Each structure stands twice: as C-alpha cells, then as structure tokens.
Design a protein around this ligand. Structure first.
Ligand SMILES: Nc1ncnc2c1ncn2[C@@H]1O[C@H](COP(=O)(O)OP(=O)(O)O)[C@@H](O)[C@H]1O
Ligand SMILES: [Mg+2]
Length: 326
C-alpha cells in the first residue's frame, strides 16, 4: 500500500520564559537533545515555531482534499500532549471573533479549498453533508445537537463505521460549513466548562461526506468520499485508554505490515474503531504530531515523536470509492 503521511509541528513557547531540547535540522529532519546520545527523526515535513497556519494547510491538507475530490477517503488528525497546539492547528485560536482570520486552522481552510475546487469542477454535481461528534470517556456526544443521547458506533457493508443517529448537516458552501464548525466548536467549549470535566480528554471528529455524480443520460457514475478531521485527546500520562488503544493498533499494524502476523483490536475503543479505515484501511491519512519544544516537555515530546515515527511505518490501501447506475 501507500505509507501514511506524518508531519511534526513545533509550536512556539510562551513569550518570556532558553534551553530548547529540540532543534530542526531541515525541512524533513529534527534532532532531539537527549543525553548522553541525541536522537534524530525524519518525517515527511518538520515545521518550526514560525510556520504559519497557511503553510500548514499547504504542506498537509491540500493534498488530502484533492484526493478527496477524486473519490478517495481521507483523514487528518492532530496528535500530541495537551497544550501542544492540536486545537490551534485544526481549528485556530478561540475567543478571537472580530479579528485574526489569518489564524484559522486546517479545518476551516479545508472547507474553503474543497468548495472552490467544487465550484470549479462546474453534468457533474456535488453533495456534501457534515457531522461533528465528540468522544469523551469512551462515550459519544453530538456537537450539532446538544440534546442528543444514545449515540453509538456501527459498521456498514460499504466498510464505513459511523455514528448512528448523528446529525448530518447538508452544506453548499465554505461559509455554511463554517457555522457547522462554529456551532459545534462552541458546544465543545461550552461542555468543557463544567464537565465533560476537561476538553483535554475529549476527541473531536468533524466529518464531511463528499459525493459527486457525473451524469450523462442515462448513466451515472457516483464517487463518494469520507473526510475525517480529528482533534485528539491529549496524549500525556496518565495515558487516556483510547489513545493507548491507538498506540496498540499502530504497533500491531507495523508488526503485520512488515512480517509476522498480529491481531489488531480496532474495537477496543470507539476511536480506533471509528478510525479503522484511517489506520491500515481504505483511506489516505495524514497525521500532524504537535510538540512543544522546551525542556520540561522533553518526556511527552519524546513520546509523541516515538508514536509518530511508528505511525509513519503504517501502510494503507486506498481505492476510489465508485459506482455506476442508470
Ligand atoms: N502555532 C502557534 N503559535 C502560537 N501559539 C500557539 C500555536 N499553537 C498553539 N498555541 C498556543 O498554545 C496554547 C495551547 O494550544 P492548544 O491548541 O490549546 O493546545 P492543545 O490543543 O494541544 O491542548 C494555546 O495558548 C494556543 O493558542
Ligand atoms: Mg485541545
């Protein structure tokens, strides 16, 4: 198959604290200063503390969206310790309403790009629906409906795992996509301040189904793509168990992809299950690993880099999800 794509993004430390623990050697390479012997890692890209939101999009998402348009499933998720910048990365800063639009993250920029590609693709027609859900403590909540209850996971023949009874909102424009996101991202923030004891333990999954029909009478070709944009629970220890499953799954896959054989429990967590195609399955996956340089993050940084390194070993098999009728 095709190896998944791993990127490392180093967020800048808070202003006015030296002594970094991490040095970027090149656009593919970084050195972790561990003693006595330093380690170096190689990824598809390494972005330093100055990297802009837009840069991130171009390096990571642009490709995924494109292959989405061509009918492949695709997935981007952000992994890393709490406070490493996952949310800033996929979403943007909070709290900034009347300004700093250049700060919006991957997900908003993805909407923009997707819809302009579509606009330009026009015979053929397009249909997009969004879902936004949150997994907290092995438990599902619908961000589009705060009154929803009893959400649960279910397999399909099409191979899709999905959340049964989650709102699927139809959107015809970036702008419409944007309130779906806004409304949900708020519910997420709003729930995190009582409990939902922390937002640092919840995974957030924003999904767009992208379905085109090329229809030249009588015949109709149908392409359908599932795009998952995920902001994970923080990876620090104690280690949240769904993330532990994530580690276990990544590991088993590697044993398998290169030799041996192994059992991979996708069903050990709602996350690994819902993401089953994203790992080793039918989809084009990109992982952004967020790390905070700086010396007191050394341990969690080391874990993140270790995790991401294996992840880069995994291979998916992704096909155009197609169909013909009429
Ligand atoms: N690229 C960046 N540039 C500047 N500040 C950032 C960047 N990424 C994150 N931050 C800031 O660091 C803090 C944690 O980022 P956040 O996205 O909340 O972390 P996480 O989602 O990993 O818990 C926030 O204050 C955030 O605004
Ligand atoms: Mg966060």
């Amino acid at each position: 198959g095709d190896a998944i794509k791993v990127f490392v993004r180093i967020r800048p430390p808070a202003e006015r604290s030296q002594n970094l623990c991490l040095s970027v050697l090149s656009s593919t390479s970084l050195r972790l200063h561990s003693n006595p012997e330093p380690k170096t890692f190689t990824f598809d890209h390494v972005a330093d503390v100055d990297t802009t939101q837009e840069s991130v999009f171009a390096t990571v998402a642009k490709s995924i969206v494109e292959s989405c348009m061509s009918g492949y499933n695709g997935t981007i998720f952000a992994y890393g310790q709490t406070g490493s910048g996952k949310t800033f990365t996929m979403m943007g800063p909070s709290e900034s309403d009347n300004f700093s639009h250049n700060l919006r993250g991957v997900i908003p920029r993805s909407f923009e790009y997707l819809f302009s590609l579509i606009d330009r693709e026009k015979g053929k027609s397009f249909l997009c629906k969004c879902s936004f859900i949150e997994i907290y403590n092995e438990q599902i909540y619908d961000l589009l409906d705060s009154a929803s209850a009893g959400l649960y996971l279910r397999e399909h023949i099409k191979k899709g795992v999905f959340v049964v009874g989650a709102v699927e909102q139809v959107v015809t424009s970036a702008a419409e996509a944007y309130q779906v996101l806004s409304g949900g991202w708020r519910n997420r923030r709003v729930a995190s301040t009582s409990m939902n004891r922390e937002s640092s333990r919840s995974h957030a999954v924003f999904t767009i189904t992208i379905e085109s029909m090329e229809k030249s009478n009588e015949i109709v070709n149908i392409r359908t793509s599932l795009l998952n944009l995920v902001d994970l629970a923080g990876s620090e220890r104690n280690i949240n168990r769904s993330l532990s499953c994530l580690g276990q799954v990544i590991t088993a896959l590697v044993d398998v992809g290169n030799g041996k054989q192994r059992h991979v429990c996708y069903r050990d967590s709602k996350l690994t299950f819902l993401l089953r195609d994203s790992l080793g399955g039918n989809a084009k996956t990109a992982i952004i690993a967020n790390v905070h340089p700086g010396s007191r993050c050394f341990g969690e940084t080391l874990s993140t880099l270790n995790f991401a390194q294996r992840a880069k070993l995994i291979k998916n098999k992704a096909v155009v999800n197609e169909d013909t009728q009429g």
